[PDB]
Amino acid sequence: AFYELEFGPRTIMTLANFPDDVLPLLQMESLMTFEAMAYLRCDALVELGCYDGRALEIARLLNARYLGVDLDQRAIETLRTRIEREGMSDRADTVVDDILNHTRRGASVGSRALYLLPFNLLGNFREPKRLLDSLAERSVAAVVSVFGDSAEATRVRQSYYRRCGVQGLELHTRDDGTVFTGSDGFYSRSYSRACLHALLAECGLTVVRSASNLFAHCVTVLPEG
Amino acid sequence: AFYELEFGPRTIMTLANFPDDVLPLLQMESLMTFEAMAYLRCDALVELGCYDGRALEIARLLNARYLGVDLDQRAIETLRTRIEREGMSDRADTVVDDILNHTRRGASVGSRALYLLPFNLLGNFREPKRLLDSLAERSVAAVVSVFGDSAEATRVRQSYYRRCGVQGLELHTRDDGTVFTGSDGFYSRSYSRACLHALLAECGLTVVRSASNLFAHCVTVLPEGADQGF
Ligand SMILES: Nc1ncnc2c1ncn2[C@@H]1O[C@H](CSCC[C@H](N)C(=O)O)[C@@H](O)[C@H]1O
Ligand SMILES: Nc1ncnc2c1ncn2[C@@H]1O[C@H](CSCC[C@H](N)C(=O)O)[C@@H](O)[C@H]1O
């Protein structure tokens, strides 16, 4: 709903609106994704909500296939021009579509694809089970990066979302995370290590690696079967 | 000189001042450092120009030692608080000193230390051979990240330095790279694949892996005569 707005994806994904304490989250998920690709021998990387290809360099340096899924057409156009200039036109592609449409009805990318859900993508879903169930039913390994329920995490997010200029930004503290809502249909929540592992268990996704810094949690998961 | 100014490191290293085209450079530099440490069995990471510990997460995920060197007091204070809260007080450490001072007269970190020169740090040295010569003693390996001489790179750099707000920003075109100067005492040059490999060869640093995207070049080097054991 929110990311169907003209400058909805831009305002959220532009580095200009990023506090300095966001970078640790982005670095942790990058290294987790990179190593998960190598160990599980994933010849493809499917970044759900790629924007301008935030995980293209991972797929590039492993000489793996890439697919960037996002609703922002302007950001996907940057990624298309980037793929051409880098010379990955043969082993890189982009689609302008809802990530749930791709995961449900889309075609396979390579033989073994890793599905990245970067920068608290799972937090922007009210019923995230629908997305995690489509991954589980796809029989593909996945990486899930979310914000933490620490005091420092919530502070960085509050700053981060205010720079983006989310109309009617309201903080809602819960036991298993902190939820930020906006008048423009903006929804985003953080996760506790326990809640995230519990949610993934409910959707039949086994945790093999689990990294957690001050700001973020990142987990590599395998579908049961 | 420029980074001894109170808000010299702050303006250059604040994410808000980064174009979106810069993140690929940082990502490539991170993945190569992460993999170099693993392959070369480095038990310690020494990030020169760490700011707020920009490579701390690499040392964290490898269970390796960490030392952040930077002139910014406020940025090192953020790193100390982060090291404390993430429970790395026994593994991680920080110093507020000139990287050349540390590299010449500083104590070693662990048995096998990899020295990271991140985000075109080597570019901000008029006489970079001074910095490269000092690495031989205290390190078994090093990662050198640096901007490219490409048209797209110079465009991103011009955009990047303008957002940082460098006083009297001037572009000086060369065959080797592109030099950006400021009236603050700011200096920052890019390198060509050839000129970088040539400079590292002159200082006795052998290139092992060499990655290059549209904007940047990143190389893993070994000092000639250093230990290559486990
Ligand atoms: N249903 C959907 N289909 C496609 N892209 C989506 C999407 N939902 C989100 N995205 C994309 O996901 C990317 C990152 S979402 C970032 C979330 C934010 N950091 C937070 O804390 O909540 C954006 O570029 C956005 O366009
Ligand atoms: N001589 C020195 N001693 C200590 N830190 C230094 C230093 N020179 C630079 N630094 C630190 O190195 C960090 C990165 S410098 C980044 C260079 C910039 N990206 C460019 O393109 O030119 C800064 O935080 C700065 O404080």
Author numbering:
A (entry chain A): 16 to 240
B (entry chain B): 16 to 245
Please give sentences taken from the publication describing this entry.
AZE synthases catalyse the intramolecular 4-exo-tet cyclisation of S-adenosylmethionine (SAM), yielding a highly strained heterocycle. More recently, AZE synthases have been discovered in bacteria, namely AzeJ and VioH, which are involved in the biosynthesis of azetidomonamides and vioprolides, respectively. Interestingly, they show sequence similarity to the class I methyltransferases (MT1). Each subunit adopts a classic Rossmann fold, consisting of a 7-stranded β-sheet (β3↑, β2↑, β1↑, β4↑, β5↑, β10↓, β9↑) surrounded by helices α4-6, α8-9 and α11, a topology that is typical for MT1 enzymes.
The surrogate is located at the C-terminal ends of β1 and β2, with the binding pocket enclosed by three short helices α1-3, three β-sheets β6-8 and helix α10. The SAH-adenine moiety is coordinated by a GxxxG motif at β1, while MT1s usually use a conserved GxGxG motif for nucleobase binding. The SAH ribose is hydrogen-bonded to Asp85 at the end of β2, and the homocysteine (HCY) moiety of SAH adopts a kinked conformation. Moreover, the X-ray structure illustrates that HCY α-amine is bound to AzeJ in its neutral form. However, while DDMT-N1-MT accommodates a linear conformation of SAH, this arrangement is blocked in AzeJ by specific protein interactions involving the Cγ-carbon of HCY and the C5’-methylene group of the ribose moiety. HCY-COO- is hydrogen-bonded to Tyr176, Asn139 and Ser203, while HCY-NH2 coordinates with the carbonyl oxygen of Phe134 and the hydroxyl group of Tyr175. Moreover, Phe134 engages a π interaction with HCY-NH2, which would increase the nucleophilicity of the latter. The kinked conformation directs the nucleophilic nitrogen towards the Cγ-carbon of HCY (2.9 Å) and induces the cyclisation reaction. DFT cluster models of the active site were constructed based on the AzeJ:SAH crystal structure.
